[PDB]
Design a binder for these strands. Structure first.
Length: 341
RNA sequence: GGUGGCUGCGGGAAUCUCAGACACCUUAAACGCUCAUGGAGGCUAUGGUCUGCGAAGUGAGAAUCACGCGAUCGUGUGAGGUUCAAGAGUCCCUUGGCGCC
DNA sequence: CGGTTGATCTCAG
DNA sequence: TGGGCGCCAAGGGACTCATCAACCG
């Protein structure tokens, strides 16, 4: 019924790691090259290249001797790089006429650390099993964390998070059954820096303690960043410290995402209606006094997870249009009930 | 002999076992390590700390178990307990930290 | 036959 | 002497989430 991405962890060997690195590099190369080519074409001509023209020129590029060493890369990687470039342009053109928010012009990119390429599924090109994954030009890659999949595999996003930590997101149109009737009809949740969530239905208020990971591991993060900054760019030990900092950040985000997953799933399995307010953290983060706390708390991710898991599992999130915490939570529940009825 | 964690594998997290170093003495906090090189600095609240018994840096290396093949150690494959939960991609924008001015 | 590749599609600034 | 310029990460906010006939070893 629903799209769903099963994120597993790859353990590619030397050759497969080299090929994943080469594929990410060539995907970035074609992204930059065709952004430059489209800009040059729109400057020289009345209109720039569209998706089909870019694909045809990419084919001519691969078949040519100028960059024939890009043919040894998975085709869907380059094609979806071009698709991402074209959807960048589509996002830019979404609301140029509108003035509510300016979507920035698509720019270049210069060797970030998180490089992901997508590969599509054509007549059994992706095969998921007990402990392996089937990728087009890689072959069999030893995975772990392989969940239970009972749907058709749409695409596989091969990622890279550290110098030696590769994930892979396998998308499938799985059937997601609606959960049984919830124990309680409706409840409202109030966010907060001191207490992460105060959720109540009028009879109890199981306040959820705020972990505040980012401030909690702020000293080790500061030490990691400082050890990085004393190191020369383009150095092996610079790369080592960079990976250390990246993994510290990955641990922080992992803990935050696990906490948010557990809390959102608990709410959706406990209440039929989960009322909350449409807080805009990107506006509050301009206040440097509370910005670090709002960044760490991640209200936006919490609300996104609550809402989409409600959509999957047959729950309704009645977001409100834009003591203290307890009364705010009760008012949120009342407003959600009013909106629903 | 007791206790706490630092680093590494165990998909994430909490635990938990193992391993590369430790520290404190029944008490809870703090810190990953080995070798080569480099020459006065690194961290922190006017000062304390580690340091010519070597500082920032720079390069390499080890960091679970079984089995297969090499002359204990390299090379390949396989396994990794436990409870909870697991939807991502794209682009753009923003701010968090550090360093220098 | 199993795997890989090139063409499809519907806006602009 | 905090704003500015370099890097390294995160979150926030919309949308989007592919298929098939030919070619090749």
């Amino acid at each position: 019924i629903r799209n769903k991405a099963f994120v597993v962890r790859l353990y590619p060997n030397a050759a497969q790691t080299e090929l994943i690195n080469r594929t990410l590099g060539s995907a970035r190369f074609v992204y930059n090259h065709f952004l430059a080519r489209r800009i040059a074409a729109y400057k020289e001509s009345g209109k720039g290249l569209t998706y089909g023209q870019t694909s045809s020129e990419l084919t001519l590029l691969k078949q040519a001797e100028e960059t024939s060493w890009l043919s040894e890369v998975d085709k869907f990687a380059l094609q979806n790089s071009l698709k991402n470039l074209e959807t960048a342009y589509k996002n830019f053109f979404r609301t140029v006429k509108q003035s509510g928010k300016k979507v920035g012009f698509p720019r270049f990119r210069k060797k970030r650390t998180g490089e992901s390429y997508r590969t599509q599924f054509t007549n059994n090109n992706i095969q998921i099993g007990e402990g392996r994954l089937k990728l087009p030009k890689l072959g069999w890659v030893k995975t772990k964390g392989q969940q239970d999949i009972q749907g058709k595999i749409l695409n596989v996003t091969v990622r890279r998070i550290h110098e030696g930590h590769y994930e892979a997101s396998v998308l499938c149109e799985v059937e997601i059954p609606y959960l049984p009737a919830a124990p309680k009809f409706a409840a409202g949740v109030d966010v907060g820096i001191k207490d992460f969530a105060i959720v109540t239905d009028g009879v109890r208020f199981k306040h959820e303690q705020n972990p505040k990971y980012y401030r909690s591991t702020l000293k080790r993060l500061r030490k990691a960043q400082q050890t990085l900054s004393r190191r020369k760019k383009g150095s092996a030990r610079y790369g080592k410290a960079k990976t250390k900092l990246a993994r510290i950040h990955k641990r922080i985000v992992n803990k935050r995402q696990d906490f948010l997953h557990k809390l959102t799933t608990s709410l959706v399995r406990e209440y039929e209606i989960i009322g909350t307010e449409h807080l805009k953290p990107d506006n509050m983060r301009k206040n440097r006094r509370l910005a670090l706390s709002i960044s760490d708390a991640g209200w936006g991710e919490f609300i996104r997870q609550l809402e989409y898991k409600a959509a999957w599992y047959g729950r309704l999130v009645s977001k409100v249009s834009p003591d203290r915490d307890e009364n705010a939570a009760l008012n949120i529940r009342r407003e959600a009930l009013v909106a629903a009825g």
